[PDB]
Design an enzyme around this catalytic site. Structure first.
Site, PDB file in Angstrom:
ATOM      1  N   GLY B  43       0.795  -1.297  -0.144  1.00  0.00           N
ATOM      2  CA  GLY B  43      -0.104  -0.050   0.002  1.00  0.00           C
ATOM      3  C   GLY B  43       0.946   1.185   0.022  1.00  0.00           C
ATOM      4  O   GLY B  43       1.947   1.133   0.561  1.00  0.00           O
ATOM      5  N   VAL B  47       3.948  -2.018   3.949  1.00  0.00           N
ATOM      6  CA  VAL B  47       4.244  -3.293   3.381  1.00  0.00           C
ATOM      7  C   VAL B  47       3.850  -4.050   4.394  1.00  0.00           C
ATOM      8  O   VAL B  47       4.073  -4.059   5.649  1.00  0.00           O
ATOM      9  CB  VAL B  47       5.747  -3.246   2.790  1.00  0.00           C
ATOM     10  CG1 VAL B  47       5.594  -4.930   2.436  1.00  0.00           C
ATOM     11  CG2 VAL B  47       6.079  -2.433   2.091  1.00  0.00           C
ATOM     12  N   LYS B  63       2.548  -5.628   9.821  1.00  0.00           N
ATOM     13  CA  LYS B  63       2.214  -4.371   8.838  1.00  0.00           C
ATOM     14  C   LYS B  63       3.233  -3.197   9.158  1.00  0.00           C
ATOM     15  O   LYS B  63       3.228  -2.949  10.267  1.00  0.00           O
ATOM     16  CB  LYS B  63       0.788  -4.002   9.017  1.00  0.00           C
ATOM     17  CG  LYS B  63       0.511  -2.757   8.036  1.00  0.00           C
ATOM     18  CD  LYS B  63      -1.032  -2.360   8.326  1.00  0.00           C
ATOM     19  CE  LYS B  63      -1.489  -1.188   7.487  1.00  0.00           C
ATOM     20  NZ  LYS B  63      -3.063  -1.120   7.173  1.00  0.00           N
ATOM     21  N   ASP B 159     -12.979   2.236   4.617  1.00  0.00           N
ATOM     22  CA  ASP B 159     -12.280   1.618   3.489  1.00  0.00           C
ATOM     23  C   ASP B 159     -12.498   0.096   3.124  1.00  0.00           C
ATOM     24  O   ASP B 159     -11.934  -0.740   3.162  1.00  0.00           O
ATOM     25  CB  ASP B 159     -10.701   1.771   3.393  1.00  0.00           C
ATOM     26  CG  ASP B 159     -10.065   1.293   2.129  1.00  0.00           C
ATOM     27  OD1 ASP B 159     -10.654   1.690   1.119  1.00  0.00           O
ATOM     28  OD2 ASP B 159      -8.751   1.095   2.233  1.00  0.00           O
TER      29      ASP B 159
HETATM   30  N1  LIG Z   1      -3.371 -10.193   8.952  1.00  0.00           N
HETATM   31  C1  LIG Z   1      -3.218 -10.429   7.457  1.00  0.00           C
HETATM   32  N2  LIG Z   1      -3.055 -11.758   7.083  1.00  0.00           N
HETATM   33  C2  LIG Z   1      -2.685 -12.098   5.862  1.00  0.00           C
HETATM   34  N3  LIG Z   1      -2.714 -11.074   4.910  1.00  0.00           N
HETATM   35  C3  LIG Z   1      -2.976  -9.631   5.294  1.00  0.00           C
HETATM   36  C4  LIG Z   1      -3.195  -9.281   6.514  1.00  0.00           C
HETATM   37  N4  LIG Z   1      -3.352  -8.049   6.679  1.00  0.00           N
HETATM   38  C5  LIG Z   1      -3.204  -7.539   5.507  1.00  0.00           C
HETATM   39  N5  LIG Z   1      -2.937  -8.618   4.605  1.00  0.00           N
HETATM   40  C6  LIG Z   1      -2.841  -8.410   3.059  1.00  0.00           C
HETATM   41  O1  LIG Z   1      -2.066  -6.945   2.667  1.00  0.00           O
HETATM   42  C7  LIG Z   1      -2.997  -6.353   1.774  1.00  0.00           C
HETATM   43  C8  LIG Z   1      -2.492  -4.991   2.384  1.00  0.00           C
HETATM   44  O2  LIG Z   1      -2.777  -4.622   3.834  1.00  0.00           O
HETATM   45  P1  LIG Z   1      -3.366  -3.534   4.350  1.00  0.00           P
HETATM   46  O3  LIG Z   1      -3.677  -3.828   5.960  1.00  0.00           O
HETATM   47  O4  LIG Z   1      -4.718  -2.956   3.632  1.00  0.00           O
HETATM   48  O5  LIG Z   1      -2.168  -2.432   4.190  1.00  0.00           O
HETATM   49  P2  LIG Z   1      -2.072  -0.952   3.178  1.00  0.00           P
HETATM   50  O6  LIG Z   1      -1.825  -1.465   1.791  1.00  0.00           O
HETATM   51  O7  LIG Z   1      -1.347   0.244   3.669  1.00  0.00           O
HETATM   52  N6  LIG Z   1      -4.011  -0.555   3.267  1.00  0.00           N
HETATM   53  P3  LIG Z   1      -4.801  -0.593   1.517  1.00  0.00           P
HETATM   54  O8  LIG Z   1      -3.735  -0.923   0.575  1.00  0.00           O
HETATM   55  O9  LIG Z   1      -5.087   0.917   1.670  1.00  0.00           O
HETATM   56  O10 LIG Z   1      -5.923  -1.503   1.889  1.00  0.00           O
HETATM   57  C9  LIG Z   1      -4.361  -6.909   2.259  1.00  0.00           C
HETATM   58  O11 LIG Z   1      -5.346  -6.508   1.280  1.00  0.00           O
HETATM   59  C10 LIG Z   1      -4.117  -8.469   2.418  1.00  0.00           C
HETATM   60  O12 LIG Z   1      -4.070  -9.151   1.114  1.00  0.00           O
END
Ligand SMILES: Nc1ncnc2c1ncn2[C@@H]1O[C@H](COP(=O)(O)OP(=O)(O)NP(=O)(O)O)[C@@H](O)[C@H]1O
Ligand SMILES: Nc1ncnc2c1ncn2[C@@H]1O[C@H](COP(=O)(O)OP(=O)(O)NP(=O)(O)O)[C@@H](O)[C@H]1O
EC number: 2.7.11.26
Lengths: 354, 364
Positions: B43, B47, B63, B159
């Site tokens: 995102g 990462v 995360k 979201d």
């Molecule tokens: N607990 C978890 N277990 C497995 N995969 C995960 C998990 N949390 C997140 N992911 C994967 O990582 C992707 C991105 O995580 P996310 O918490 O959405 O970070 P982000 O990229 O900063 N937010 P966004 O891109 O705006 O939805 C998710 O849509 C999942 O496919």
């Protein structure tokens, strides 16, 4: 060989409809508003595109009204328009008969993208210059396109002529009159639009044009994102965090001011090493946070990046001469007449009276 | 501002040891060691890595987000107070010095979930098939439970989309994730309208409203349900106008009053007057009528007219889930569906008379 005959009104001139016959109809496009077909005029054999849209009987079509007054070599020409009934009901359709153009900047750029190839800079110069000319022209009438994107930039590959199309979002912007902030496609939306401004100006078209230039240089969109926040983060990564005044310049309203303070990313490190410095310089002058700080379309046309186009010996890679580039009119130069000195080179348009 | 300790347990296996703060429990720092790191998400913010806990052998997700020394991380602050079976759990968190500069990174260690509604739906879409309705019911029900829970705290996710809905295929458990856009909505306080992913944005967001409520999450959940039934997004569009057009095609032109409900400020009123599209004509033949009914009560122009998450859970589309003999197609038992807490039911306690089925009240 099914022939269709209609009584259509010339796109420009007097409202004196004439019988027009065409054949070989086939769908060549679509949109949330209507369908675009291709057809061949029986009399001339010329190919045209017919954009069909549902028309509100009780009101006049803004796209039609705007098209009827435009006449520029870099804007698709409205040949005729006519009405047809939609058997589905007492529904009436407005049919815009336009010049048919074979390609779009979108498709051409996709070819090079897929072939892991860069679109030759000569084309980037030609396409962007012509886009800026079309914007200089519509902006001089106070008309903003509001949907500048690769798919709305028609191209004839053999002649290298670009023609702006789709005036379905176009509108004359009047200082002080509010306008909707939900126009313009994602990736090409000016920041003030993402921030929800309703007092934006025609300079939103310049930001969009800058996004197209960067994309042709990069080989992919420069500010991608599925949400406004993502898009803004991608903008901030390149331009750095917007000043309080800059935010105020875009839209002195939006509450959220919490955004990672990122230092401006050197525009040079943004593009591949081979990228011409002039292209990068022009880019930095289009993609500016403060709307009023962006170059006007006419100024963009006069930029050094387009100097090769003004060279008397320039030729297209296919050996042909370049298309029309210097037939400026008073109206087109009205935002800054003195630029004619740069825009019309010494060798251009030289014609005696015999 | 913390640090890590890298080593090699054996076989050259790289082991990272950090000192983390428990996610929910009291502040008792614990030592955590993990191996086999690999990116599993991304995102513009950060990462997400997958990692294996050295002792339990358990997999977790980490995360990693850049931390602003300026203020506190809103995502962390929210994740810390949440505890629900349909929301991914924050095990602990720790800071790591980004070897790139004086930049600090916040690392949230979460329970690892193998799939996402997005990936699953795409698998069926590709095969030109549709997800069996029992799964649609189970996933959507669990999503509404998670929303009833966060909303009870005044927290709006902002979201909701398939990629933010984690799934465990075998157990059919769904866990809401990504609280990076989440915020407590306080009446009278303005909020940005550029949040939420395209396709799932409520019409009031498209119209630029800053006085929206948690009901924007309900519109999004409705878009997810419609998408699972259709096999493709219901309101696609590259621009807001295109999205509004797809919405109008189905819901019909919004009355002047409905427009006033979403946002009493935007200008453009010029929009083709289309008649309401029979929802039944929107979905494939044989689509459960109850599914179509629920959809129509979620995807409403007037924000206050949409069902609340708790009300959605009680909808008849979910009646099958309350059947004492319901089971997963794989013969396995359904996940926890009725362990509602007072907090979760706070918005309308009497709904419990429907939400908790008789068999779930048996003493035994
Ligand atoms: N607990 C978890 N277990 C497995 N995969 C995960 C998990 N949390 C997140 N992911 C994967 O990582 C992707 C991105 O995580 P996310 O918490 O959405 O970070 P982000 O990229 O900063 N937010 P966004 O891109 O705006 O939805 C998710 O849509 C999942 O496919
Ligand atoms: N004159 C033309 N010649 C050839 N193809 C055209 C022409 N005008 C339009 N098209 C094709 O049809 C597509 C849609 O036409 P357009 O005028 O954009 O209608 P629209 O769908 O209502 N607007 P939008 O989809 O938002 O760009 C274009 O992007 C082109 O690929």
């Amino acid at each position: 060989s099914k022939v269709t005959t209609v009584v259509a009104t010339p796109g420009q001139g007097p409202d004196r409809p004439q019988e027009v016959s065409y054949t070989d109809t086939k769908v060549i496009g679509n949109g949330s508003f209507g369908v675009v077909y291709q057809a061949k005029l029986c009399d001339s054999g010329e190919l045209v595109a017919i954009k069909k849209v549902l028309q509100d009987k009780r009101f006049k079509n803004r796209e039609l009204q705007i098209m009827r007054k435009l006449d520029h070599c870099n804007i698709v020409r409205l040949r005729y328009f006519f009405y047809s009934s939609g058997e589905k009901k007492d529904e009436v359709y407005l049919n815009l008969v336009l010049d048919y153009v074979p390609e779009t900047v979108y498709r051409v750029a996709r070819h090079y993208s897929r072939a892991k190839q860069t679109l030759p800079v000569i084309y980037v110069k030609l396409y962007m210059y012509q886009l800026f000319r079309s914007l200089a022209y519509i902006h001089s009438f106070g008309i903003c396109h509001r949907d500048i994107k690769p798919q709305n930039l028609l191209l004839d590959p053999d002649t290298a002529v670009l023609k702006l199309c789709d005036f379905g979002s176009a509108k004359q912007l009047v200082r002080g009159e509010p306008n909707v902030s939900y126009i313009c496609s994602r990736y090409y939306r000016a920041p003030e639009l993402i921030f929800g401004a309703t007092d934006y100006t025609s300079s939103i078209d310049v930001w969009s044009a800058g996004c197209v230039l960067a994309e042709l240089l990069l080989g992919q969109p420069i500010f991608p994102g599925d949400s406004g926040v993502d898009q803004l983060v991608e903008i901030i990564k390149v331009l750095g965090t917007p000043t309080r005044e800059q935010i105020r310049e875009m839209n002195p309203n939006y509450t959220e001011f919490k955004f990672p303070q990122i230092k401006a990313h050197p525009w040079t490190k943004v593009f591949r090493p081979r990228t011409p410095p002039e292209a990068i310089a022009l880019c930095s002058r289009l993609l500016e946070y403060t709307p009023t700080a962006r170059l006007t379309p006419l100024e963009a046309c006069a930029h050094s990046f387009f100097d090769e186009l003004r060279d008397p010996n320039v030729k297209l890679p296919n050996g042909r001469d370049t298309p029309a580039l210097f037939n400026f009119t008073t109206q087109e130069l009205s935002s800054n007449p003195p630029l004619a000195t740069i825009l019309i080179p010494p060798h251009a348009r030289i014609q005696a009276a015999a």
